[PDB]
A paper describes a structure:
E. coli NfsB belongs to an extensive, functionally diverse nitroreductase superfamily, members of which are united by a conserved structural fold and fundamental mechanism of catalysis. NfsB family nitroreductases catalyze the reduction of nitroaromatic compounds, a step that is pivotal in various biochemical processes and exploited for bioremediation and cancer therapies. The reductive half reaction consists of initial hydride transfer from NAD(P)H to a bound flavin mononucleotide (FMN) moiety, and the oxidative half reaction consists of subsequent hydride transfer from the reduced FMN to an electron acceptor substrate (e.g., the nitro group of an aromatic ring).
Here, we describe our solution of the E. coli NfsB F70A/F108Y structure to 1.98 angstroms and comparative modeling of each of SN33623, CB1954, and metronidazole in the active sites of the parental and F70A/F108Y enzymes. Each dimer has two FMN binding sites, located at the interface, and contributed to by residues from both monomers. Acetate was present in the crystallization buffer and has been reported to act as a competitive inhibitor to nitroreductases. The structure of the mutant and the parental enzyme are largely identical (RMSD of Cα atoms between the two structures is 0.32 Å), however some significant conformational changes were noted in the active site. First, the aromatic ring at position F70 is absent in the double mutant. Second, the side chain of N67 adopts an alternate conformation in the double-mutant structure, effectively widening the entrance of the active site’s entrance channel. Third, in the double-mutant active site, we observe the side chain hydroxyl group of Y108 participates in direct hydrogen bonding to the carboxamide/carboxyl groups of N117 and E102, respectively. Fourth, the aromatic rings at positions F123 and F124 are displaced in the double-mutant structure compared with the wild type and their average B-factors are higher, suggesting greater flexibility.
Numbering used by the authors:
A (entry chain A), B (entry chain C): 1 to 217
Write the structure that this text describes.
Amino acid sequence: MDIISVALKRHSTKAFDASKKLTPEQAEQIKTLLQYSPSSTNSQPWHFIVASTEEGKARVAKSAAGNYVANERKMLDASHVVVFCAKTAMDDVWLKLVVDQEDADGRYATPEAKAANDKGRKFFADMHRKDLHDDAEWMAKQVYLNVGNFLLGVAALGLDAVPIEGFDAAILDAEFGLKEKGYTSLVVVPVGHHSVEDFNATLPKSRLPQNITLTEV
Amino acid sequence: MDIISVALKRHSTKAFDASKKLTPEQAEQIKTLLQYSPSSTNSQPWHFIVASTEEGKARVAKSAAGNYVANERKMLDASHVVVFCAKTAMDDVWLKLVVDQEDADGRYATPEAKAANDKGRKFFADMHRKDLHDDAEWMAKQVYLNVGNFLLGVAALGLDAVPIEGFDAAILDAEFGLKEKGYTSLVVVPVGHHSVEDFNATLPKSRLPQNITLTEV
Ligand SMILES: Cc1cc2nc3c(=O)[nH]c(=O)nc-3n(C[C@H](O)[C@H](O)[C@H](O)COP(=O)(O)O)c2cc1C
Ligand SMILES: Cc1cc2nc3c(=O)[nH]c(=O)nc-3n(C[C@H](O)[C@H](O)[C@H](O)COP(=O)(O)O)c2cc1C
């Protein structure tokens, strides 16, 4: 089926079949999607935790215990659980890693082109770090864009998923020592195959009409 | 084209062929993708401007005149230009439109299920607009998730696109009267077909290795 079929038919999975696992092929495919997301200035201001062990999933699921138990079971029963993390600050060392990797990949003909690109990336980075002091929000936005890309990609692979904001980020950060590493957890996405308990697999999709949300000019 | 091939072969178009237009089918398909993006609590806190006339695109392109000239040319040369807008405040009238639509689309068996889901959505909204005072940032994150969905989607339709943060949002908001309508422009995505001047169509994609960005547990 075409990508519009995928967009109309994917859903937020509310219950996962704990017997059904990604193939080793699908495990590699979902990591490719995470890696190859676009981002502003190719800043890639992100870390992914991909929990596939029973222990790893249980460690992520701690973030949902008590106040978010419906979300806790999705993290325990899915095959693979992705934690989307943003960097907590945009530093020149990260931007150097990115330009060096672009240089390794051969995107710069001359040291002058490499310098020009670094200069331009820094201009955008400084609008956030220095002028607006919103660089943490700007990086977080790029991570959400990756989630958007990710949810559509895993649906087109024929996999079930659910994006989760209902979790305790302080608990999840502490569990994986993310603050010390320069990251903060934003979104958790369990990936797998829905079970018969997934009420949402058969509910109609609901969106506002285009005559409310979309202007043509 | 499997979706991993789409993810690995899509690119940020640096120049559009102004003679190559979306087909009528494609023009409807890109609007479906905008509408059916997921969002936290199905909040859909967004407006889209789709500019396809010369006059409409020129009005968008004013936001990039002067200090973003490359971006200006992309907006003038693409077939269709999408302005992604966030709501500036999460109000109870928008939450009522959303739950009334979910009710009209058949997601609720009883008035009780509807009130229950309305109160659940209000708990989340209130965390942002009452506790954290970050509903503007929260809604802007949902719009960036829509953008991530959209860029992979249009690539799967065989269309070229580039996401643009390099514009003046104050000029664009003024040009369409967005502030008074309760919205702000976040990202501009020209859609169409790349030209011969698109140097980025023949460069390999560059991303940080998984051994930096990705921990398996
Ligand atoms: C939020 C966002 C804003 C962007 N803004 C611009 C822009 O103003 N101009 C531009 O030429 N490219 C822009 N890009 C494209 C990025 O530089 C590009 O996504 C990144 O280098 C990765 O390359 P790819 O998209 O070709 O995979 C933007 C990308 C994102 C995700
Ligand atoms: C950013 C984000 C966070 C979400 N958090 C949760 C969550 O904590 N629990 C949950 O069951 N669903 C969650 N969802 C799923 C949304 O309710 C869902 O995307 C929305 O109702 C649209 O329905 P669909 O995803 O089935 O198309 C989240 C979705 C988004 C986009």
